[PDB]
Design a protein around this ligand. Structure first.
Ligand SMILES: Cc1cc2nc3c(=O)[nH]c(=O)nc-3n(C[C@H](O)[C@H](O)[C@H](O)COP(=O)(O)O)c2cc1C
Ligand SMILES: Cc1cc2nc3c(=O)[nH]c(=O)nc-3n(C[C@H](O)[C@H](O)[C@H](O)COP(=O)(O)O)c2cc1C
Ligand SMILES: Cc1cc2nc3c(=O)[nH]c(=O)nc-3n(C[C@H](O)[C@H](O)[C@H](O)COP(=O)(O)O)c2cc1C
Ligand SMILES: Cc1cc2nc3c(=O)[nH]c(=O)nc-3n(C[C@H](O)[C@H](O)[C@H](O)COP(=O)(O)O)c2cc1C
Ligand SMILES: CNC(=O)c1n[nH]c2ccc(Br)cc12
Ligand SMILES: CNC(=O)c1n[nH]c2ccc(Br)cc12
Ligand SMILES: CNC(=O)c1n[nH]c2ccc(Br)cc12
Ligand SMILES: CNC(=O)c1n[nH]c2ccc(Br)cc12
Lengths: 352, 352, 352, 352
């Protein structure tokens, strides 16, 4: 009988139940997976310096993301094609987010439509993750749908001019199961790695800061740059009028040998000088990871793979369980470190 | 036939004879057990710079803890529920301490009573480890019993507003064997982890420095703060009139990802400026560990798990054997490093 | 059915098909193979700081080596006796280089003649790797043949006064398969390790900077010093009128315990002050390795073992496949790091 | 058929042929064997920066130890009870040393007599390793015998007031095979670890610098302090008129957790300011180890365990083979690093 009490248990259970090609697609990093290992190892190098005797009977995990209240600084990151993991895919995910009172970043290519997800999760805090397609009419349609269907921000992914080289996907000749489809667009629906070639056909490798200007003019919605790893690029994003930075290495699935996100976070927080919120994804598996990211000045963190593992175990209930595990680990890490609320999580809590 | 000649052998023997759930309870750290590994690895990073030709024919291991003479700077730390390991539990432990001429820190929740332990070990140096219960009358009763029964200090544990998340205990659904009871208090006797929920019900998560003031007013007994890991908290403990700091991460069982105790010891010794004795626990398994802790300015060290392993092997005789092993390793480490007595163990003996 | 999608797969396939003594000869480093491991591990320590939104739709990999255009900054290094790996040996290699539009460094002892290789690869960019033989007439003949047959530079190997001690070759009592011969010279044709004793008989251990002066006077061809690991030696090579430095530890096959080539590259680039091109070999297995070497100021890199593994798999087609794998990994690493061409690969892309 | 081409092969062969208790006695370090691992690992951290084109056709390995010429800076260290490894024990060893033209340090407790060893090796360079026995008449007799029988120095061991705690020896209840005896003295002949208790009975733990003064007055022979790990002690040895320092941690068999000898060597070389020769033992297994020790300012190195492994394989011939392996590795390391002789091995050859 499954007894899954931490994120790692969910991954182990997912490996046991998913087809190998699908588990490999979800698990993989790029090339030799150096950054994949480092996203996790880096968190272990940051040590915690807990304060005692601070009164933690009433721990308040609540915060805000881009002015929208959330129950905890732990939000769902964009993961493509969620119906591969569970028949309810993105609808299971958004229902879990609504229950938890946190936000869902929806992949511009999901196996579910912008409208279907807003319908399933009307009261959920919802954001759209955008790629800049070679087809700018496709791209504008996605932004307009997001605006009309009550999405609260655009996360524009800037680290994927081309897909990374995930060796298992190349070996398995990965493609979507037959009955599934990217449901916001034939060849654009994703009817070697089939995904790499799909991207080579649909995603624009020419995107530049000029296209960020276009997007900033297209929508008044808050825009976050997702995939920044350098302070100079972070400063450029602020200069282009963007409203946030998601420090991300794409789950270590793009360029291998980039630093862990927790290691580059302080340089990015320093570079933006408090002008915009900074977020982190990559390697978040435990409450202490959330605490270290907030101590180093992230407003909130996003989780990618853990959500897929929850779906694989039991759809909406499995996503809810994963998010509740992270919530309760984060509560306990705050309490044991002497933090009553997120506003008193300070830089002195951590040292590398 | 058991031939146990070092602490690690006692652990291996304990694993072979204890029920898995009990061995797991004793062995575990919190979450991924990063700090548990580091408590041991950290000692190996501190290298010894021995002096030669100093005349070590007459090595004197004796010292004092809070003005009470002990035979060696190696004392028994508080470990709950010792009758799980051996039918004689805390009584076996205190008899061994009396034989060795060292001190026993008694867990405020032992499977034996403050009076039963003072009766078994009348000539033993004995201290009480205190939790601040939500029930302050319970808490005062424990302090008064400790005073009446000849205990020489209070170690107030400050790092446990809630219990840490020990995964094995959650998986094993840990609880005390049926015939046992915390014998100083029904639900307060400890009739997921049952221990985590017990603490959530009995231990006060609201404790603050104000409660330390209350305790300092309640008793004239020496009070040591157990669980401090930051210099600022150590300085606060001194300002509250406390008489010692036990640098402890609770055997790595509370917040995971805190530093090893041997690594934070020098910051704490520096912070208290010689106003109070500083002690260390966490990872002590060898005579050289004791030597490194004293070289970095600890007065004495406490051992937790090694004592449980001694009880598991042969009750009082097994505790005595464990303490004699540590005594003789510590004698040999002093002799080979050129130290005739504890007063000449200096900071130049170690370098990280 | 072989499905070889990265350099490591080619090595694994080579181990499966080559006689053990031949695979061991190709794989080995010197002594305990510390530098062999480090040539690879060192690349992983250099982290990439990619720029986003730079427009990488049109990536241009082309560069030049000593004024000769190449398709990519990835060239074939000298590896002796290539007919052990495949019946077509050096002819397979040069044909693959001609197809790719990159250069081949031909081993002065190949199982194929300077003329045979120029005949097979007339349009290929070709250089000769030279040892200074005790027989200077032999040595001059090789240089003159290289000049007459359209070779564009001399790489003089300076780190092999004697052969390194490769333990497997000593254990296997290594020697060339019977039908093969070093085809540019009986005992000089290579008719414990037979190779070590061959070198002890043919290669001059007395070579000094005076012999570099002799070589500089012998030919007007560009000369590169191969095997430099110190800045002072690099500065000496420039003072002797040489035209390049190949930072090399001989694939970790000579002196064990020297640093990784990627770690010494920056000291050498600094020492030559832009007077000559600096190249690197040792441990190049991935596109990101090429990118890190160019970010640290190498003009191009050479690959040794990967080429042998390509030959072992399928001769010319296997060499072509290996070079195309490296080309495409390097294209993707440039694109994901925001580099449109090799001239914009800058030092800020990397940090150790 | 044994094919032993490096020191490690000799150890592997010794494990295969010796009784477990004897192999364990020879192999062991103290306690958890942290320093034992580090004596070897430390050498790997020191990297070599070889010079090229220096003319190494004529490599001269010769040097001098305390004014006596040797063939190579590689000498035999004192290892007790050599007849356990081979019936010819110390006589096999001294004959091998005479053949090689290097020196033998004879253990004051050997299974062979000071006279027997001088008889077997009349032309060998021979030194006596001395313990200060509680019996000073025993101690004086050994020194006088050494003087009369043509020994050229006294190595006084200063790191063994008591024997280290070698766990395997305690578990195996180690003692000499029955027919053997320490042949320079009943209980003094060595008729838990029997060795630890023997030392507790024969070796004086009270030895101080005052006893060094006594020894300096007893003999005009050169005296080297063996077991120094601190610069202050090295400076004290010079002030007492001693003529050398052997940087040694006793093969990591005494105090565990001391640094590797190669790591403390530079501090000791700096402390003695060129007043006396500094030597190293501990972890020497390869020619590159010898080169790194001389680059950091040791005059010569001693080998302990490798000599025992040679005896175990084939007595005198096995010792000769081990010493010839080290000689030839050291020749090759000098040649590949550009060193014609030991006088040009400089500090720029190494960097940690
Ligand atoms: C299966 C999978 C699919 C992903 N799909 C997308 C995507 O559609 N859009 C996107 O911007 N990022 C995508 N990412 C990256 C994630 O948004 C996120 O940056 C990453 O998963 C965070 O690291 P973690 O998995 O360690 O939590 C995907 C990641 C995974 C593992
Ligand atoms: C089984 C077990 C029970 C413990 N019970 C208590 C307790 O009742 N009170 C307390 O303050 N600390 C308790 N601790 C923590 C110990 O006092 C001590 O800080 C820790 O064991 C020291 O580390 P060591 O086990 O590595 O020697 C316990 C530790 C263990 C392993
Ligand atoms: C099998 C083999 C043969 C080699 N033969 C030569 C040679 O003839 N001349 C030479 O200068 N270097 C020779 N080398 C060294 C290579 O030119 C080159 O420096 C090294 O292979 C680069 O490292 P890599 O194998 O990690 O790519 C050889 C290396 C190998 C593995
Ligand atoms: C089996 C054995 C016996 C030893 N006996 C002695 C001894 O009699 N006197 C002494 O001063 N050192 C003794 N030593 C220490 C050695 O002289 C030397 O310091 C050590 O072996 C050097 O390290 P290595 O074994 O790594 O080469 C002994 C070491 C070993 C391994
Ligand atoms: C890591 N990323 C993916 O696997 C991914 N990222 N963006 C995508 C768009 C479509 C598809 Br299908 C997959 C992805
Ligand atoms: C690590 N700690 C424990 O396991 C512990 N610490 N304090 C306690 C009080 C009661 C019980 Br039961 C167990 C404990
Ligand atoms: C690593 N190097 C070799 O294995 C090598 N290097 N130069 C050579 C010349 C002839 C032969 Br055969 C082999 C080699
Ligand atoms: C490591 N050392 C030994 O094992 C050793 N060192 N000194 C000795 C004297 C007698 C005997 Br037996 C053994 C030893």
């Amino acid at each position: 009988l499954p007894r899954l009490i931490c994120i790692n248990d969910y991954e182990q259970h997912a490996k046991s139940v998913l087809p190998k090609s699908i588990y490999d697609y979800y698990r993989s990093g790029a090339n030799d997976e150096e950054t994949l290992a480092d996203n996790i190892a880096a968190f272990s190098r940051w040590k915690l310096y807990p304060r005692m005797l601070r009164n933690v009977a009433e721990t308040d995990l609540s915060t805000s993301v881009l002015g929208q209240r959330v129950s905890m600084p732990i939000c769902v990151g964009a993961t493509a094609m969620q119906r591969m993991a569970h028949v309810d895919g993105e609808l299971a995910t958004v229902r879990a987010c609504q229950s938890l009172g946190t936000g869902m970043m929806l992949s511009s290519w999901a196996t579910s439509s912008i409208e279907e997800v807003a319908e399933a999760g009307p009261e959920a805090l919802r954001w759209l993750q955008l790629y800049i397609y070679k087809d700018r009419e496709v791209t504008k349609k996605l932004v307009r749908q997001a605006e009309k269907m009550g999405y609260k921000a655009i996360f524009v992914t800037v680290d994927t001019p081309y897909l990374g080289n995930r060796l298992d996907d190349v070996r398995n000749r990965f493609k979507l199961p037959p009955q599934l489809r990217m449901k916001n667009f034939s060849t654009l629906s994703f009817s070697d790695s089939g995904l790499a070639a799909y991207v080579a056909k649909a995603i624009d490798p020419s995107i530049s800061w000029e296209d960020i200007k276009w997007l900033r003019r297209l929508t008044s919605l808050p825009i976050v740059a997702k995939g920044i790893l350098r302070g100079d690029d972070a400063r450029e994003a602020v200069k282009h009028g963007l409203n946030g930075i998601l420090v991300s290495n794409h789950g270590a699935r793009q360029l291998d040998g980039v630093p862990a996100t927790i290691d580059v976070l302080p340089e990015i927080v320093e570079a933006v000088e408090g002008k915009v919120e900074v977020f982190l994804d990559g390697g978040v598996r435990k409450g202490t990871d959330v605490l270290k990211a907030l101590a180093l000045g992230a407003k909130a963190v996003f989780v990618g793979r853990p959500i897929v593992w929850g779906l694989a175990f039991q759809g909406e209930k499995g996503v809810q369980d994963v998010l509740e595990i992270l919530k309760e680990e984060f509560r306990l890490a705050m309490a044991l470190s002497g933090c009553q609320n997120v506003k008193v999580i300070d830089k002195t809590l951590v040292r590398k």
